[PDB]
Design a protein around this ligand. Structure first.
Ligand SMILES: O=c1[nH]cnc2c1ncn2[C@@H]1O[C@H](COP(=O)(O)OP(=O)(O)OP(=O)(O)O)[C@@H](O)[C@H]1O
Ligand SMILES: O=c1[nH]cnc2c1ncn2[C@@H]1O[C@H](COP(=O)(O)OP(=O)(O)O)[C@@H](O)[C@H]1O
Ligand SMILES: O=c1[nH]cnc2c1ncn2[C@@H]1O[C@H](COP(=O)(O)OP(=O)(O)O)[C@@H](O)[C@H]1O
Lengths: 296, 316
């Protein structure tokens, strides 16, 4: 019995909504392909209950899913079964505005309306790109995009596959941007930190192994730049096994994880992917040079 | 997998809505008992899709369910599973303003707004009646009540268990009220396939339902307390509906359709069904129940009395 009990009412509307739309979809046949209208489509539902079902949900809310057919197909191409998606959002409240499902499998980012319009500007070319690389990419994997309205105010969310493992605790994080400026991390933010370009540079961390990652990444960033996208960051995460199976993951679940070489001094397993692709040609080149210097 | 395909957008919406509300109800705990709020509660949902899922449902529709919890409770008390109710409304479209679920189990009537209000005025006492008789009534057994909005316009629908058997064909039917007034089936009506015969048609035909003692008392006591209850609510125009099933005729019809290549029933399911007396001429099976009870106010005391004195000797 999916009681939608959450940390705050918009989370329970989210759980209700993802549940509702995913069931709805279970009743819609998967087509032999997607169509232009599928990229201009949306689901909208409005709930006014009165003295009924109020114990955990609101009595008045709205839920809109953008291009449900396209995002369900994306879900299939990324290897996510729909009822696993549904279970991870609905079994227990998402946690911590940026959220993870209770099982650390997916992240739910609160997003500006400009970003929703950017998603619509790109989505056909993004889908064909997922098609052409058979999902082997490092761009964020978009699994749904929703708009919740509750108590009056609208909120936009983009669900995506987590860059990090849902199992192995990540021990250090770096948001590399390739800046010609010097994006360092704040003393305030230093006191698990988030290190940017200058600090992975003046830290001495290297990543050891092999090279087909460079093929995947360069394809991704040539694509993003060929679409006037900027401000994206490559996110890197180190898990030192030694802290205390260890360095044990399922490469079909953590599709971004990667094992160290015997070279590596510490016992490390890495996770890496591109993030924040919703908003310049020089950006791609500088970004790629800085990400080049990183391997051993 | 449910397409909700149907001949009319209205029916598709009815299937979608019964599905949605039963599924929503699935996640709501079953209370220890009902609070008064539940008797003035409702659940609305308004759908407006766009370029999505329009093969059968309209893009734009609304669906309201009344006192969903007391009708869930009623369903329980009437021995109907929520899953079953949902499936017989959604597995295939209902058929023929009146509707029947594909499996001939439940009936969906289009009613007025005032019928809805009248059901609301009486619902609290009706639920306590159904409670204090364990679901042993001739009264209609109300399973849900809804309000659909297709293409801008509202339709009110009341779901009820069928007085007729889902298996056993009905060969003759009567609608009786005990009116002093000459109530007879029109020459237009008297010439349908299964005509709906009124009182005079029952009398000029000398029809006698012969059920034998024990079932005759179940019936007479049920009818007595049912219509006393209806009277106390100042409710009128209710009819007793009786369908006659010809056992031998059905045996023959089945034989004639099996050539184209028992006489028993479940009172768990055909709740208004009664067998004919052992020493009876034709082996028949009857279905008898009161219907059309959502109309408030000679006096309704008088209507109770005349109705009862009539149906008292409809059978013997
Ligand atoms: O809870 C109730 N206790 C008693 N009586 C009720 C209750 N609930 C409804 N009634 C009556 O039930 C009829 C159907 O009317 P309705 O309300 O379902 O339709 P709305 O008025 O909302 O009009 P709308 O602006 O949405 O087009 C109207 O006599 C309405 O007073
Ligand atoms: O997939 C993820 N798993 C865990 N944390 C993430 C993930 N994606 C982003 N984050 C966290 O949220 C931060 C903000 O990233 P993003 O670049 O998308 O926001 P921005 O638009 O302010 O630059 C990331 O640097 C990281 O701290
Ligand atoms: O449960 C049922 N099973 C089969 N027929 C029914 C059932 N309920 C109603 N009917 C048919 O519908 C007719 C009209 O019933 P009712 O008196 O409730 O509607 P009304 O508002 O037109 O008078 C009944 O006389 C009977 O012919």
């Amino acid at each position: 019995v999916k009681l939608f009990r959450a940390s705050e009412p918009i989370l329970s509307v989210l759980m209700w909504g993802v549940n509702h739309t995913i069931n709805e979809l279970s009743n819609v046949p998967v087509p032999v392909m997607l169509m232009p209208d599928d990229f201009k489509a949306y689901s909208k539902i409005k709930v006014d209950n009165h003295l009924f079902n109020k114990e955990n949900l609101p009595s008045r809310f709205k839920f809109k899913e953008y291009c449900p057919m396209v995002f369900r197909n994306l879900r299939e191409r990324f290897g996510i079964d729909d009822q696993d998606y549904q279970n991870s959002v609905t079994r227990s409240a998402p946690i911590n505005r940026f959220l993870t499902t209770y099982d650390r499998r997916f992240v739910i980012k609160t997003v500006s309306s400009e970003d929703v319009a950017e998603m619509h500007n790109i989505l056909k070319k993004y889908h064909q790109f997922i098609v052409e690389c058979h999902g082997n990419t490092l761009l964020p994997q978009f699994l749904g995009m929703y708009r919740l309205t509750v108590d009056g105010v609208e909120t936009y969310m983009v669900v995506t596959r987590d860059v990090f493992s849902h199992r192995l605790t990540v021990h250090r994080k770096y948001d590399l941007k390739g800046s010609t400026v010097a994006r360092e991390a704040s003393d305030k933010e230093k006191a698990l930190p988030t290190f940017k370009d200058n600090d992975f540079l003046n830290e001495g961390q290297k990543l050891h192994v092999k090279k087909n990652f460079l093929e995947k990444l360069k394809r991704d960033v040539e694509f993003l730049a060929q679409l006037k996208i900027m401000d994206y960051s490559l996110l890197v995460g180190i898990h030192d096994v030694d802290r205390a199976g260890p360095g044990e993951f399922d490469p079909s679940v953590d599709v971004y994880a990667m094992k160290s070489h015997e070279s590596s001094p510490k016992k490390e397993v890495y996770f890496m992917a591109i993030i924040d692709i919703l908003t310049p040609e020089q950006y791609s080149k500088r970004f790629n040079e800085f990400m080049s210097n990183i391997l051993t």
